[PDB]
Every structure is written in C-alpha cells, then in structure tokens.
Amino acid sequence: ATFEIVNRCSYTVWAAASKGDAALDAGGRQLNSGESWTINVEPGTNGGKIWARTDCYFDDSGSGICKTGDCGGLLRCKRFGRPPTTLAEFSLNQYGKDYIDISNIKGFNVPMNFSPTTRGCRGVRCAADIVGQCPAKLKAPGGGCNDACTVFQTSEYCCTTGKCGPTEYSRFFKRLCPDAFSYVLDKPTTVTCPGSSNYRVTFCPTA
C-alpha cells in the first residue's frame, strides 16, 4: 500500500512511520511546507502508525531530538514517538479489510487528515486547534496537548484494568475531534476500507 504524506503546515515537520518494533519504509523524513513523501507499507501491516514530529534537530548520522513525537532520537523511527502525537493508525489486509483511524489517545501535536486515495470508504480528520484550546494541565511545554494518561498515569486515564470511562480530559479531545479516539474505550471511530487501499496523510489539512 502507498501512503502519500503531505505537509500542508507552514512549518517543517518530520514525518515518522512505524509499527512499533520496526520502521515503515525509511521510517522518517523531513517535510518542508508543501513537501510530499510517498511510502510503501507491506500488505498485512498490523498496528502501523504515522505521525508528525515538530522542532527536530538531527546531525549527519540521523540522530537528534524532536519536541513532539521523538522516537528515541532517530530521524528514521523504529519505535513509536513520545506524546504528544496525533496518530494516523492503520491495520491493512485484516481478513480482506483495511482499518484506519485517527487517535488522540497519545495527545495531539499537529492537525491531520487521514483519507484513502482509492475508493470504497471515507477519511477521518482531526483539524481543530487542540493546542490552542488545550487545558492548562495537558499543555506540553515542548508544544502540543498531552493526553491525561501521559500526564497523570492513573488507571482511569490509561484504562489499565480494561474498565474506564470518559473523563473531563478525554471529553475535551472528543469535543474538538469527534472522529478521533479520545480514550482507550472510546466508541470506535475506526473506518473500514477495502483491503489494499492507498492513503494520504495530510498534516495541517485546512491551515
């Protein structure tokens, strides 16, 4: 499957694509404002995520730091990024279907549209100004809006017992982005697409 990752932001982001134990394609790249990066994701990829990283500094070797979404200091992510990170999440070719979602479960840094470029399903978007509206206690100094689990490390916010409810903090993400996961047991906003669909992730889809 091909994912085109477009940075429509006015600022540089460093895209990342990982399934948690491995890079997807090259795993990361600098995207200036307007740049598009086309990656190939192996069919049957389960638990893939794409995100943006902000305010990165990498040396000649691809080693450095980002203020949001840093994946152990690498340009080319093998691992998932440090919250806060708006997440494009996908599992491909799962019994003939692709499953995509946007998640705010790990917070929000950059607004995002996650849309198929092939037919048979709709995209999802979280493009509200979550950073500007972010409650004081979730504001990441680095930039971005943390989820309550990352900040407070409670069973309720992290849903550790597999039982938990919405929270004042989850409801803030849900109010600004109804079509993204706000907490672990949120009513799924997963979209079902045909197996072997192709996708575009757009950072800053409206701005």
How far apart CA 88 and CA 109 sit, in angstroms, is: 12
Amino acid present at 63: S
CB 84, CB 146: distance < 8 Å: yes
1-207 domain in CATH 3.40.80.10? Answer: no
Residue 33 phi/psi, 5-degree rounding, is -50, 115
CA 92, distance to chain mean position in Å, is 16
Q: What was the resolution (in A) of this experimentally determined structure?
A: 2.3
Within 10 A of 94 (CB to CB), how many other CB atoms are there? Answer: 14
Q: How was this structure determined?
A: X-ray
Domain boundaries, the chain: 1-207
